[PDB]
Design a protein around this ligand. Structure first.
Ligand SMILES: CC1(C)C(=O)N([C@H]2CCc3c(O)cccc32)c2nc(Nc3cccc(CN4CCCC4)c3)ncc21
Length: 306
């Protein structure tokens, strides 16, 4: 409602800053560690879609620190990405070079690789759900599930890991062309173009780009390249010479000694109790404190609390 009494349980742990997004989205501060976060504040009147994010932990998937649920609201503390929408960056520069695109597109593959490993399909890969962090590294976000220009042909018919490969195809195209491969003023026509499968091939595109694009943008799902072959594809490996490392560097089971020690001093508990406690991953204040500590370390900053 209009009520400000919900923000009470929140402001225990967090100190608010400006609004964005108006779900309303506020930039906040985690009091104990001082790290910036981003709170998705939702007014009841998708529960499971949260449980999804609880199991996903990966350096290009937007991290979930804390869930606060009252009878009047639900708050979602998430990694704050300063760099903004990938969409805005593409328009910002008209179009990306192959070398740059490759840097970005490798991060997108790593994430989508990973999500699939956990048996989830993102089903909404558009450059509006890829945001830059301060490192200018990419972070995937919306697991709510148009958007139509990114829909695989099979989804338009009715009838998938493979549909994600189609959208990554549309991504690669836009990244390197700066406009969509299938686009129109008239929706029914846009349906049509997509289903046909024919797109322009701008002069500035290398044949490697054209090859990969062709293998990803297959109108038939089975003829579409597979996640396996994509990871080490010759285009993907071009300046790197190692395949995409999609493996999570942020585990549920490997806890951090440096981080647990500091937390032990604050809660006045021993290393065993604390570790057992953190390992429950309740996504309460403890989960947010440990995770935000890891990040606080990942900046090479002091592993201290307030
Ligand atoms: C918690 C979460 C996941 C979220 O729900 N949003 C919303 C907020 C606006 C927005 C968006 O533009 C695209 C996707 C998601 C969201 C988020 N948005 C950011 N960072 C961000 C987004 C757009 C623009 C900018 C940069 N501008 C605005 C602030 C100064 C310059 C940053 N991080 C996390 C989220």
């Amino acid at each position: 409602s209009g009520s400000m009494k919900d923000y009470d349980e929140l402001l225990k742990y967090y100190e608010l800053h400006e609004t964005i997004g108006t779900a309303k989205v506020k930039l906040a501060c985690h009091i104990l560690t001082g790290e910036m976060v981003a709170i998705k504040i939702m007014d009841k009147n998708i529960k499971t879609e949260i449980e999804a994010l609880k199991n996903l932990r990966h350096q290009h998937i937007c991290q979930l620190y804390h869930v606060l649920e009252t009878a009047n609201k639900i708050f979602m503390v998430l990694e704050y990405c300063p760099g903004g929408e990938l969409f805005d960056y593409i328009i910002s520069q008209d179009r990306l070079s192959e070398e740059e695109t490759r840097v970005v597109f490798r991060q997108i593959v790593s994430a989508v690789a990973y999500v699939h490993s956990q048996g989830y399909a993102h089903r909404d890969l558009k450059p509006e759900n890829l945001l830059f962090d301060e490192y200018h590294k990419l972070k995937l976000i919306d697991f709510g599930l148009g958007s139509l220009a990114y829909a695989a042909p099979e989804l338009i018919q009715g009838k998938g890991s493979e549909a994600d490969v189609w959208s990554m195809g549309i991504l690669l195209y836009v990244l390197m062309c700066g406009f969509l491969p299938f686009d129109d003023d008239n929706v029914m026509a846009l349906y049509k173009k997509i289903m046909r499968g024919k797109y322009d091939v701008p002069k500035w595109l290398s044949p490697s780009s054209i090859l990969l694009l062709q293998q990803m943008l297959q109108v038939d799902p089975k003829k579409r390249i597979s996640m396996k072959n994509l990871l080490n594809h010759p285009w993907i490996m071009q300046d790197y010479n190692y395949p995409v490392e999609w493996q999570s560097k942020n585990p549920f089971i490997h806890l951090d000694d440096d981080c647990v020690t500091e937390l032990s001093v604050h809660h006045r508990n021993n290393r065993q109790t604390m570790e057992d406690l953190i390992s429950l991953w309740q996504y309460d204040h403890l989960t947010a404190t440990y995770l935000l500590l890891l990040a606080k370390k990942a900046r090479g900053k002091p592993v201290r609390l307030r």
